[PDB]
């Protein structure tokens, strides 16, 4: 399937989503460090077989 | 194959730390070893450190 | 037989910046023993109040340009690190700078506070190039010891979100240059005693007598442990 | 403002005359200013007969 830039990322808190806008891209001027999310991106993988 | 691209531009400001390579114009290389306090810096009689 | 204690004699101010204090009753070699040990504590761990956090008008980050000012935001931040001020009963104060109109914006265009003393009202913050160009800024000044670079000031985080709060590097310290010279001082009767001429240099935010006392204060407090040795852990 | 005073200080003596004390933690550069100023007074101005 197609990959989404949506701000909906499995298993992440608001502190991650703090630095992000509604669209999933970091605000201009947010000072960032290692591990911070610049662009939210999600790729389809269905029926994992856990 | 690419639907969209987000290019983010970070401005990192790095100062100086042990390990940077520095050289004069005369072919004298060097790698900063320790970053010393002004207290341990050699000074002349007038008191201006080096 | 026993010993002799020193004292400070004439503290001769020359400029608000630089001055010569003197200490007369020094025994043999104690002028050197002190002068370097004092130079040590003088240059480093002296309290000072330097600007820390600066939030301006239309600017998201230090890498932008304000329409109407020929100084890049980064360069204006750098100008602030060199603004010398002094407060009294407040350990951090936020100063509001407002100005507009063509011309230089000096350090005297800010808003005075009870504890605000601008020691260099002529200090250039930035210029202003267009008739009706206007700049408002919140300048957060704190007091502390040593050198705290802006980098080490990002680990507490915990929502310092305000995108417009530009941290600058903390230079907290008054002292610029310290030099000591010991010339031999003979009080009329003693074999040989020495003087201490300590020639210092300052940003104008501290008077010599206040400084040299709190300097000497830390010494005995560090020697405190030193005297008896309880092998403490 | 306020300052640092050390802790943990072990004096491991090798005979009653000679010894190695160690004292940590000292702030930046305070190790020399003390170490030298006391070396100064021990070697120079100490009373003895």
Curated annotation (Swiss-Prot), chain B:
It comes from the Bacteria. Acetylated on several lysine residues in the presence of glucose. Co-administration of salinamide and rifampicin or salinamide and myxopyronin suppresses the emergence of resistance to both antibiotics. Disulfide bonds: none annotated. The RNAP catalytic core consists of 2 alpha, 1 beta, 1 beta' and 1 omega subunit. When a sigma factor is associated with the core the holoenzyme is formed, which can initiate transcription. The rRNA transcription and antitermination complex (rrnTAC) consists of RNAP, NusA, NusB, NusE (rpsJ), NusG, SubB, ribosomal protein S4, DNA and precursor rRNA; S4 is more flexible than other subunits. In pull-down experiments interacts with CedA. (Microbial infection) Interacts (via flap domain) with Escherichia phage lambda antitermination protein Q; this interaction renders bacterial RNAP resistant to transcription pausing and allows it to read through termination signals. DNA-dependent RNA polymerase (RNAP) catalyzes the transcription of DNA into RNA using the four ribonucleoside triphosphates as substrates. Resistance to the antibiotics salinamide A, salinamide B, rifampicin, streptolydigin, CBR703, myxopyronin, and lipiarmycin can result from mutations in this protein. Belongs to the RNA polymerase beta chain family. This is DNA-directed RNA polymerase subunit beta. It comes from Escherichia coli (strain K12).
UniProtKB/Swiss-Prot annotation, chain D:
(Microbial infection) ADP-ribosylated on both alpha subunits by the phage T4 protein ModA. ADP-ribosylated on only one of the alpha subunits by the phage T4 protein Alt. It comes from the Bacteria. DNA-dependent RNA polymerase (RNAP) catalyzes the transcription of DNA into RNA using the four ribonucleoside triphosphates as substrates. This subunit plays an important role in subunit assembly since its dimerization is the first step in the sequential assembly of subunits to form the holoenzyme. Part of the processive rRNA transcription and antitermination complex (rrnTAC). The complex forms an RNA-chaperone ring around the RNA exit tunnel of RNAP. It supports rapid transcription and antitermination of rRNA operons, cotranscriptional rRNA folding, and annealing of distal rRNA regions to allow correct ribosome biogenesis. The N-terminal domain is essential for RNAP assembly and basal transcription, whereas the C-terminal domain is involved in interaction with transcriptional regulators (such as CRP) and with upstream promoter elements. Belongs to the RNA polymerase alpha chain family. Homodimer. The RNAP catalytic core consists of 2 alpha, 1 beta, 1 beta' and 1 omega subunit. When a sigma factor is associated with the core the holoenzyme is formed, which can initiate transcription. Both the N- and C-terminus interact with different regions of transcriptional regulator CRP. The rRNA transcription and antitermination complex (rrnTAC) consists of RNAP, NusA, NusB, NusE (rpsJ), NusG, SubB, ribosomal protein S4, DNA and precursor rRNA; S4 is more flexible than other subunits. This is DNA-directed RNA polymerase subunit alpha. It comes from Escherichia coli (strain K12).
């Amino acid at each position: 399937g197609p990959e989404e830039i949506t701000a909906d990322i499995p298993n992440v808190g608001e502190a991650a989503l703090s630095k992000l806008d509604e669209s999933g891209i970091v605000y201009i001027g947010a000072e960032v460090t290692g591990g911070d999310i610049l662009v939210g991106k999600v790729t389809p993988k269905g029926e994992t077989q856990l | 194959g690419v639907l969209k691209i987000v290019k983010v531009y970070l401005a990192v400001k790095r100062r100086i730390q042990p390990g940077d390579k520095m050289a004069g114009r005369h072919g004298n290389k060097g790698v900063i070893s320790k970053i010393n306090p002004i207290e341990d810096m050699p000074y002349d009689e007038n008191g201006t450190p080096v | 037989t026993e010993f002799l204690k020193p004292r400070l004699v004439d503290i001769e101010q020359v400029s608000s910046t630089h001055a010569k204090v003197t200490l007369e009753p020094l025994e043999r070699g104690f002028g050197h023993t002190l002068g370097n040990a004092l130079r040590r504590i003088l240059l480093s761990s002296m309290p000072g109040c330097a600007v820390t956090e600066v939030e301006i008008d239309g600017v998201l980050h230090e890498y932008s340009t304000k329409e109407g000012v020929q100084e890049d935001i980064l360069e204006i931040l750098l100008n602030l690190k060199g603004l010398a001020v002094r407060v009294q009963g407040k350990d951090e104060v936020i100063l509001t700078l407002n100005k507009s109109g063509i011309g230089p914006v000096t350090a005297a265009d800010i808003t005075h506070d009870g504890d605000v003393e601008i020691v260099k009202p002529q200090h250039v913050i930035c210029h202003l190039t267009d008739e009706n160009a206007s700049i408002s800024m919140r300048i957060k000044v704190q007091r502390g010891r040593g050198y705290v670079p802006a980098s080490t000031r990002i680990h507490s985080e915990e929502d310092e979100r305000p995108i417009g709060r530009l941290l600058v590097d903390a230079c907290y310290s008054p002292v610029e240059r310290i030099a000591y010279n010991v010339e031999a001082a003979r009080v009329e009767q003693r074999t040989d005693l020495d003087k201490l001429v300590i020639e210092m240099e300052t940003n104008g935010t501290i008077d010599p007598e206040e400084a040299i006392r709190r300097a000497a204060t830390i010494l005995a407090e560090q020697l405190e442990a030193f005297v008896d040795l309880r092998d403490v852990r």
